[PDB]
Amino acid sequence: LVILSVFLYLFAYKEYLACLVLAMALGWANMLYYTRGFQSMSMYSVMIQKVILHDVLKFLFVYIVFLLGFGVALASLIEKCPNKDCSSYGSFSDAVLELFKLTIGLGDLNIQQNSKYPILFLFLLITYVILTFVLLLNMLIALMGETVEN
């Protein structure tokens, strides 16, 4: 990333800043290799082993299933409207984006989404919220697995 940032900077690319900032951040992250036995970077040093194995990929598969299914279920419930459409759950991609932003704590759920069935829409939205929370908390208790002695 660093050498690519340099090559893109001496060329007339304004896309070098992305690689340079990513390289800076990844280097500050690689600073873990030197501080693994410091009792404060313990959780990172051990979740290099725990979370990278399979639980994060199981979580990713189930989460993609949740996202795609609920994106279809919510985009289907929305009525074509005359062009902000009164609904941010418009096409399938907009519903998938809203759901992703939701599990990323970037969104907002409103009862007004221009649906013929607003109660069913709200039901499925809250169901998605609760299911993604269950998923996240499974992964959380997996990553922690304290038994602090062990």
Ligand X SMILES: COc1ncnc(OC)c1C(=O)Nc1nc(C(F)(F)F)c(-c2ccnc(C(C)(C)C#N)c2)s1
Look at residue 114 and give its three-state secondary structure.
coil
Which residues does 98 contact at the CB level (< 8 Å), separation at least 6?
74, 88, 89, 107
Q: What is the CA radius of gyration of the chain?
A: 21
Q: How far is the CB of 97 from its own copies (least distance, A)?
A: 6
Gaps in the chain (C to N distance exceeding 2.5 A) after: 82
Q: Would you count residue 3 as binding ligand X (CB under 6 A)?
A: no
Q: How many helices (H) and strands (E) does the chain have?
A: 6, 0
Stretch that binds ligand X, among 11-19, 29-37, 78-86, 111-119 (CB under 6 A): 29-37
Q: Which is nearer to its own copies, 68 or 142 (CB)?
A: 142
Q: Would you count residue 20 as binding ligand X (CB under 6 A)?
A: no
Q: Which is nearer to its own copies, 69 or 145 (CB)?
A: 145
Q: Would you count residue 16 as binding ligand X (CB under 6 A)?
A: no
Alpha-carbon gap, residue 109 to 99, rounded angstroms: 10
Q: Which is nearer to its own copies, 61 or 133 (CB)?
A: 133
Which of 43, 57, 136, 145 is close enough to bind ligand X by CB under 6 A?
136
Alpha-carbon gap, residue 141 to 2, rounded angstroms: 36
Binding residues for ligand X (CB under 6 A)? 22, 25-26, 28-29, 31-32, 65-66, 69-70, 73, 102-106, 109, 126-127, 129-134, 136-137, 139-140, 143
